Amino acid sequence: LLEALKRQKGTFETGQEDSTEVPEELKLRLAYREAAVAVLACYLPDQYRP
Amino acid sequence: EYLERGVDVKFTDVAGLGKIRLELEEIVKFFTHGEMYRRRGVKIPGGILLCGPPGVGKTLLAKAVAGEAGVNFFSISASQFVEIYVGVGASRVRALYQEARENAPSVVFIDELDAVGRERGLIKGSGGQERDATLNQLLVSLDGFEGRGEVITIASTNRPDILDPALVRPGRFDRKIFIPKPGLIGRMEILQVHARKKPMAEDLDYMAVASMTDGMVGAELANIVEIAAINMMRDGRTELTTDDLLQAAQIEERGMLDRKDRSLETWRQVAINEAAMAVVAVNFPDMKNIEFLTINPRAGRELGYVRVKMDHIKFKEGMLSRQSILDHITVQLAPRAADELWYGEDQLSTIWAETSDNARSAARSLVLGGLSDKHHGLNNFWVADRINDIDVEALRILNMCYERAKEILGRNRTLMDEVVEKLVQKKSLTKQEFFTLVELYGSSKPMPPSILELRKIKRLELEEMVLKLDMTTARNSS
């Protein structure tokens, strides 16, 4: 059911063979962005979207 | 009428498949193991749509899946449905689906649905009404009333945004598979299968040919195979090698190499231009790996060119740094830098006018692309003063790249003269000799730290500061 929902809302758009060596400089940027979002969301609590 | 004979194409005939091939054999499973599919209570998905760049051979995939399915194959051009007369196209679709249902089990293929799948209400004419009628007829024969459970339609489009969302409704076209451009291994296997019909050698390495021709479709690889047959009889060698493939790729991506009469100062000017580009590029990270350097005029470009192959992952996704563009603008401005530093300010030429505008366009795209630091990005304002100041930062950015190019090219005069002399004498240069000259006469290029070193020093500074805070709390409290 989870995979059917994932397909049916069209999350994927590239549609290629997902085998790509991601550099550390990219994993770091994504981790820092996500951590900053987490810190700001926890410090500024949204009463409807935790 | 719409039935074809002799469909022997299989999955082995087609290369560059990948995991999409799995879905393809899933379709074959839909044509073979459907008994347990309907036993469990699964309605067979009729609509599968292949979307991708042209020349990847979508119709070839259709022949492959039809041959592996072992059913009747229908291949109908969508251009025959649109006509100046109305009603006849609807009858054509009716006869098509009726003979598909009579020939069950079967698979039907229609290519380039953008001609007839256009959203209704975009053109005002009788052709639009006929297109609407044909779309309605195919919609009804697809899902309208009961009577089809065995006929499966396969389609091949290029632009998925043009299609009517009514067609994209599940039960009509629910499986959407994208066929990407072949990567490295895909180009390898496409070259192999397109070259199986010709006698090849055992020392033939497709790795260099695949890495040389990056970002091209399978039709272009078939073309590379087609320029692997015509050009060796000029010299008359024995067996095909990788050198002919490399030269064929070089000819295809740029044009045929033609020689014309030329003076010495013209060659010197093209040489110092190419030297400016390569010498300013090698000291920058994103354009460091210069592999080729020639001043030979080609089709459409009387100039030479510098060949670099940067990482092609950050460029597509958009993870290029701000410094990565300030470096490229300097690279585009450096031909004018060499011209000014060699022929003086009063004798500027017009050969660098194609890079000098690319630099200013890149600066303009940078300043209103949110990458600046004036307030914080903020590419749009309201009052006229800030709108006028928006275009000031682009010109100052060009000026600072301009002085940076002057400094970079002035640091490297000896290697400049050496590479200009070599470019005039040989008319071409590869990576090894150019880099050897760079190591012989290069200046110091202190590399700025990457993001890893910055993260490490920031982390250790943060840890030492937080433990300093810990002791200033503890020993003052204890």
CB-CB: which of B19, B178, B319 is closest to A29?
B319
| Cβ count within 10 A of residue B176 | 18
Residues of B with CB under 8 A from a CB of A: 18-19, 51, 170, 177-180, 183, 313-314, 319, 450-452, 455
**SS3 of residue A50 by DSSP:** coil
Helix axes B384-411, B264-282, angle to 10 degrees: 110
CB-CB: which of A15, A20, A24 is closest to B313?
A20
Between CA B128 and CA B132, with CA B129 as vertex, the angle to 5 degrees is: 90
Distance of CA B422 to the CA centre of its chain: 33
**Residue closest to B289 by CA, chosen among B309, B306, B304, B314:** B309
Question: Rounded to a whole number, what is the distance in Å from the CA of A15 to chain B's nearest CA?
Answer: 5
CB-CB: which of A13, A17, A24 is closest to B19?
A17
- B320: Cβ contacts below 8 Å, ≥ 6 apart: B286, B314
- Helix (H) / strand (E) element for B130: namely helix B126-139
Assess contact for B291 and B246: CB atoms under 8 A: no
Question: Rounded to a whole number, what is the distance in Å from the CA of A37 to chain B's nearest CA?
Answer: 18
User: Any idea of the CA torsion for B16, B20, B25, B28, to the nearest 10 degrees?
Assistant: -110
**Residue closest to B153 by CA, chosen among B282, B66, B247:** B66
Task: Using an 8 Å CB-CB cutoff, list chain A residues near B183.
Answer: 16-17
**Residue carrying structure tokens 């190591």:** B439
**Residue carrying structure tokens 């020093």:** B457
**Residue closest to B245 by CA, chosen among B277, B203, B274:** B203
- The coordinates were experimentally obtained by cryo-EM
Question: Rounded to a whole number, what is the distance in Å from the CA of B20 to chain A's nearest CA?
Answer: 8
Assess contact for B120 and B132: CB atoms under 8 A: yes
Q: Do B177 and A15 touch (CB under 8 A)?
A: yes
Q: Do A15 and B179 touch (CB under 8 A)?
A: yes
Q: Do B314 and A17 touch (CB under 8 A)?
A: no
Residues of A with CB under 8 A from a CB of B: 8, 13-17, 20, 22-26, 28-29
Assess contact for B117 and B157: CB atoms under 8 A: yes
**SS3 of residue B111 by DSSP:** strand
Assess contact for B406 and B338: CB atoms under 8 A: no
3-state DSSP: chain B helix, strand, coil percent, rounded to 5? Answer: 50, 10, 40
Spatial separation of the C-alpha atoms in residues B236 and B358, rounded to whole Å: 44
Residue B207 corresponds to which tokens in the numbers above?
Answer: 């790795």
Q: Do A17 and B180 touch (CB under 8 A)?
A: yes
Task: Using an 8 Å CB-CB cutoff, list chain A residues near B310.
Answer: none
Residue B219 corresponds to which tokens in the numbers above?
Answer: 């039709």
Query: Which residue numbers of B belong to the known binding site?
Result: 52-59
Query: Which residue numbers of B belong to the known binding site for ATP?
Result: 52-59
Name the residues of B annotated as catalytic. Answer: 274
Beta bridge partners of B163: B118
Strand order in the sheet with B152-157: B72-77, B106-111, B152-157, B47-51, B175-178
